[PDB]
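Margin note from the TA: students keep mixing up input and output lines. Inputs are the sequences; the output is the structure of the whole complex. Example:
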Amino acid sequence: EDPQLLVRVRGGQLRGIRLKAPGGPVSAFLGIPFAEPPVGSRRFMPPEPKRPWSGVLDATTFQNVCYQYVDTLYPGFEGTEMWNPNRELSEDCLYLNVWTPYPRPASPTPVLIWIYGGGFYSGAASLDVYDGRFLAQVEGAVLVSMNYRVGTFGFLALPGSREAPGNVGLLDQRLALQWVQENIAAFGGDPMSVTLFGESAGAASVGMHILSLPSRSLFHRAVLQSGTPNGPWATVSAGEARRRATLLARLVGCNDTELIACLRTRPAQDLVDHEWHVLPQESIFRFSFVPVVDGDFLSDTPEALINTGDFQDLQVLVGVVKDEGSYFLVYGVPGFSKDNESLISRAQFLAGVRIGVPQASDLAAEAVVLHYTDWLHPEDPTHLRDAMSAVVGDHNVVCPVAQLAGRLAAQGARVYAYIFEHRASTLTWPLWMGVPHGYEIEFIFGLPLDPSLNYTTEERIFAQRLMKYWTNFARTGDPNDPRDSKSPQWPPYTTAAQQYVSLNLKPLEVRRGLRAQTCAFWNRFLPKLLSAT
Amino acid sequence: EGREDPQLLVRVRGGQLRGIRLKAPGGPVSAFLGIPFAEPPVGSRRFMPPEPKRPWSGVLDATTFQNVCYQYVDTLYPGFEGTEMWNPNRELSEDCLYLNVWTPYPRPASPTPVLIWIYGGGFYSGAASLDVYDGRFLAQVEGAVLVSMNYRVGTFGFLALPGSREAPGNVGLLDQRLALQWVQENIAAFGGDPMSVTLFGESAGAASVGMHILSLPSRSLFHRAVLQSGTPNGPWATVSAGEARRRATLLARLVGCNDTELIACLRTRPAQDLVDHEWHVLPQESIFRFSFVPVVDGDFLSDTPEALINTGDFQDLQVLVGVVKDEGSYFLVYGVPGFSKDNESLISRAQFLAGVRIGVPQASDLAAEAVVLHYTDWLHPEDPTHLRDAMSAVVGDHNVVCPVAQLAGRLAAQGARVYAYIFEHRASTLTWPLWMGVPHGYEIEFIFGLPLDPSLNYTTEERIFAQRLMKYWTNFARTGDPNDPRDSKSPQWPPYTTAAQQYVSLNLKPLEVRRGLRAQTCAFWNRFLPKLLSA
Ligand SMILES: *[C@@H]1O[C@H](CO)[C@@H](O)[C@H](O)[C@H]1NC(C)=O
Ligand SMILES: *[C@@H]1O[C@H](CO)[C@@H](O)[C@H](O)[C@H]1NC(C)=O
Ligand SMILES: *[C@@H]1O[C@H](CO)[C@@H](O)[C@H](O)[C@H]1NC(C)=O
């Protein structure tokens, strides 16, 4: 028995496994339960703390993936499959993972907590691109990731009800955060230095923890990659949630109590079968069961909360990739496919816009088309295709991020912002998709450091830079290297100068204004136009 | 006659004329100035269509400019050349329907292409006798025959009670039309070719040229057209019948006045009383808006200019159109607070929003917001230099650049041959401040060739530049193409098309071809704004 691999937590004893990273061993404790399985009558309910166990719990392997829809658009294609569950599906899924240096840190070490994305309907902490061994080995970090309930299981809500209050998937995350506070010291983690980071719906989750008081004592700094709590997809009102839940119940053949009781009799796959059928419009970048503005977890809309919050003791790193919108086009916009160059017509552009901005009035959709049309080349299919991608990325990610960065900075937060512009040499999606949503993650987690993965040498060097910025940020709230002169420094994002940096193979370059003109259209004009209808 | 110069005696349909020999830098020219082309539109003829001048006896002296049509006189900056050069330079009178002819001396032996100038001035001012419209240089250097006419402006030319017999509207345009008919009948007496007539005008004169293109009875009176910084479409050049009726009747009230009775009472009023109140009838505080302009009467204009350029067939037409680099700037000192010729006019964000309401006076609150959001620099939203230049651009784009873009595109799509330009050289002799850039109206002195006059103090390069522009304009008049055939070396001026949207820059450097005339911004003005203000 390796003493490094044996740990006592409040619930009892755990046995981890020694893993191999390129530069040395790491200790991994995988599949640690942090909650009572949310099964049977506990479906849709807030999580409860895991009961203590006897003997030594085996934590040498990843646990089950929370029950979820599985992407089958391109069967066996690497680009889709790498996001799909890589362990058995189960509602019994509330487990977390810890990687630490081997031997375990002599002094309390900064902790990073990862929260996966996947539209709040999918994802798992066990995916290869979330492998924490590189950050632990190279940077001596303690890295944590948890599973949380997705889809109906995590976010179906009859607001006001006792038994389906909503946001229970965010409560799972929070319970894992509490677990880190109470237990991470046993692994050598420093509970007084905890940084949340996440991507897409994971980033929106992080933002929701920033905006919800009981979460605030559980972390100190946050990183939001390609996602925000504000914006068009990350939340629904109480009314729309109630509507969606009642429709789903109707669809599976199901007095909130009676309705929820009947939903609890249904096999998991029956719920998943109908989950996509409750969206009000044909759309992309829209998800059926997401966090709900409940007046509890979220005391108000994220927009209202970022406008009035006090964020003076907060540091945040936020950013986007160069082509946020591109991969969403192939899941519902006619004319777009991964298997050709997706050269679309003007008609397909206008139709694409109604799907990418499903909430738009005729006039709003016209404003969008006119803004994104290149009037020198109004019919050029290459411009129209790239414009369609920009519409989706700007509306769903870039402009919401620019808005959040500006509000946080105006309200006293220390903010750093980036645009990630390197396309992985190993990417299997076609060239026209550019640097797609999600494809910065492998570099931040340090996967290029594994020779067997076939990244280039420049990519290994680049990944090492990114691991440094992220862990520097975790340690200090500043991604700049504490020692090491030779610039250029990454300056804070401010409302005055709006500075951000490009992350690519070349040295940091500083830019000003994150799509400032176009985001002014989305953030300032669109709302008025929509209200005026 | 007996000892008079034999080259200066000419007969026209109405009688004999005696002209005068003028000195141009390169040699003499013939001028016949103050030729009546209509009965004086005075007394009971005020507000009425012009009647053709009745023959006179003896030799009419045509050696000096005639009266300027009664009009408001600009007094914002007293004694300042920048405003004075546009002011009347002959006596104001309702008896003002006269035209002017310059020709080579001695007169051309074979029929020469004719250029006809129609001045601007917002349809409320202007005169064919201003120094900047002097035809002697074009006549002398290019051998052109040049005509310019006075037409009624303000209430006298444009006050309308649509449907009445006594004040049908558009009579200033009918004054112009009558001058064009006069050219058809008489210009051959001067060596001019009635089968080659090119209209050109600036601002309201350009809008006028546009209206002759759109009005069938004018179409037989000219062959080609040049529109400088103005268009018949757009927000200022026409009013609906309803709005014209409303303005005429408010004006009648203001001066103490059944259409027949109202109009008869207006006819008893002193010309100057009409002028003193004309500005009081605009529906909002504004700039680049004028009280009495062409009206959509269903007669001269059978429909709005926008509809007529949308559905017209313009296959037999060649058109040259363009704009100066800073159309909007000088309009800002006549009514946007924060703006002045005498300082840098750095304004605040608040003054920008207020200026937008004045510059787009028809805008709803949301439309105004769209304009502000579009023109704001979101990296420097409060920067006074950017706000100042953005205010200028709002005014220039809304009133001139985008209406021109819309016109060029429609004309081309519908068969016309179109050439487009942007004029970018600021006269070295300009008295307006630098921040105004290359302001509205300041290409004119170059087209007419004033820099050839040594006493005007233009630079040598400006002299050469002026000669190039005279050439482009006269080549265009002669053949419908600004390019010189006997010179394939010089860069070519390609036609404007919907596909490529080419236009050229006019400056001291050789022609440079550019693409898209403020294409993104003009899509906002021409496609989106209309939909936004309906909603
Ligand atoms: C690319 O593939 C899609 C899906 O089959 C097809 O509809 C489209 O026509 C192809 N390319 C284009 C944009 O024509
Ligand atoms: C320029 O002059 C005008 C009128 O005198 C004035 O309103 C404006 O404030 C001045 N601008 C500045 C900044 O001096
Ligand atoms: C031209 O230059 C001369 C020499 O200084 C000057 O006396 C004259 O006033 C100038 N003319 C004009 C129109 O400015």
